[PDB]
Amino acid sequence: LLDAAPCEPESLEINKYFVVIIYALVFLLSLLGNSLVMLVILYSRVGRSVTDVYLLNLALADLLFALTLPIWAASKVNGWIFGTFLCKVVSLLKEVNFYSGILLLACISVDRYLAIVHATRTLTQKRYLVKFICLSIWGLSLLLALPVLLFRRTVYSSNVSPACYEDMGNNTANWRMLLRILPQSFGFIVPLLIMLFCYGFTLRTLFKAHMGQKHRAMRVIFAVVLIFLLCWLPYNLVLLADTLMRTQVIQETCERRNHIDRALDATEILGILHSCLNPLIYAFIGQKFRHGLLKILA
Amino acid sequence: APLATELRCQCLQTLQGIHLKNIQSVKVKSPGPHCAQTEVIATLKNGQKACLNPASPMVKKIIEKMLKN
Amino acid sequence: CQCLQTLQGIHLKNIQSVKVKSPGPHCAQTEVIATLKNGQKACLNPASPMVKKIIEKMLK
Numbered sequence: 215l216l217d218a219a220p221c222e223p224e225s226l227e228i229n230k231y232f233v234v235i236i237y238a239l240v241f242l243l244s245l246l247g248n249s250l251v252m253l254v255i256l257y258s259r260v261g262r263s264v265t266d267v268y269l270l271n272l273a274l275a276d277l278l279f280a281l282t283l284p285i286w287a288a289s290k291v292n293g294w295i296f297g298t299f300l301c302k303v304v305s306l307l308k309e310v311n312f313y314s315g316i317l318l319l320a321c322i323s324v325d326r327y328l329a330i331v332h333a334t335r336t337l338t339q340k341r342y343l344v345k346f347i348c349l350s351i352w353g354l355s356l357l358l359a360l361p362v363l364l365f366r367r368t369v370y371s372s373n374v375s376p377a378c379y380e381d382m383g384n385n386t387a388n389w390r391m392l393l394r395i396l397p398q399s400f401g402f403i404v405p406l407l408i409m410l411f412c413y414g415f416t417l418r419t420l421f422k423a424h425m426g427q428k429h430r431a432m433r434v435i436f437a438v439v440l441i442f443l444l445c446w447l448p449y450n451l452v453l454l455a456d457t458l459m460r461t462q463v464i465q466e467t468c469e470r471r472n473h474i475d476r477a478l479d480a481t482e483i484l485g486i487l488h489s490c491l492n493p494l495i496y497a498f499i500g501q502k503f504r505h506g507l508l509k510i511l512a
Numbered sequence: 513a514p515l516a517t518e519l520r521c522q523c524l525q526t527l528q529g530i531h532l533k534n535i536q537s538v539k540v541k542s543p544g545p546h547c548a549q550t551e552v553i554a555t556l557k558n559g560q561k562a563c564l565n566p567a568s569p570m571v572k573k574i575i576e577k578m579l580k581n
Numbered sequence: 582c583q584c585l586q587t588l589q590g591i592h593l594k595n596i597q598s599v600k601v602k603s604p605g606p607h608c609a610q611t612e613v614i615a616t617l618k619n620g621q622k623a624c625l626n627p628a629s630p631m632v633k634k635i636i637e638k639m640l641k
Contacts, residue, residue, distance in 0.1 A: 215527070215560060215562055217525070217527075218523070218525045218527045218563050219560070220523055220561050220563055221524060223514045223516055225514035230515065290515065293515060369519065369545050369546075372541075374514050374516045375514065375515055377516065377517065377519065380545060381544075381545050384544070384548065385543075386545040386548075388548065456518065467524070468524070474518070475517075478517060478518065479517070482517075
């Protein structure tokens, strides 16, 4: 009989209450950093370059994501008790801004590639399309977040608390697994490959250069790539593990389910730090922004 | 009381032949956002929970006898 | 007993699950409790053919 018994979900309030403080801390830090980046960029219109436009869009996306975080924290505390309307709205905002952030990082990568590698060539002139590239990225992000709005509701279980989950009919499991392809291809793989190509060739050109500031630029590029990987690779690895398990590729057991759930929680917490870390890596690591910020404070 | 961001089926494998004398209750859950297959879970008088195979005639017989009362 | 008077008007499109509890020390009468997709719980008459229809449709 024990050979065939239901898998009992496993929880731990010790982490439930700790996740609230983690989310609140990230909320505050992202709010402050993105607000400062926006203020510094928008205070003076002098010297508004392509990078400034990209950073302004990125700060907007990160600020919106952070602004949605607290509702997610309360949900983690007590489950989605807020209704279906807020489930759809908050999910749409969160996913739109997630896609926007990733694609803006890829755009910044391509911009730096064109500015450094093709500095002598005429292709660098094509990096003056920031406004329409950013608008297209926002549009694509809005397009890719439609399934979240269309197929989400508050699902009530019998052994678990209500969740802002999907409802796609009798085959919701398989459709959800397929819909997972979008966040893992337009959200991890394609941006990761674009960033790797662009920054690899950028590093190849810099290493052969004779500048005095090549070294700091190389360190900054390495930090950007490593932060992106640290933030997003673990979550997508855990997601792929779950997808493999659901399809019987990896044998399924209760303990493995518990492990994947814990991993998903931890990796979501880890990935939520991109909003906090973007302002430090892309905006305040350059002398222009720091000088501007010091100027404004007067 | 617990939490989860991934709803999963409540049964990994199923049996057939649970004796009604040891059945306290039976729960039937239709396909939905949780699982792609119907789930039958019998809670016995001693607290043990046993999954059942929906296709087996035994489950249908047990349920109909229980309903007849 | 978890039910006093049975309900009506529950369509199969709104039912999420059905739980059938047999007689015992808790209650002397068989009970059927249906969990709807909105979280509300509805008590159904076990003798009513509607419960049998719902259960047989679900098992299929």
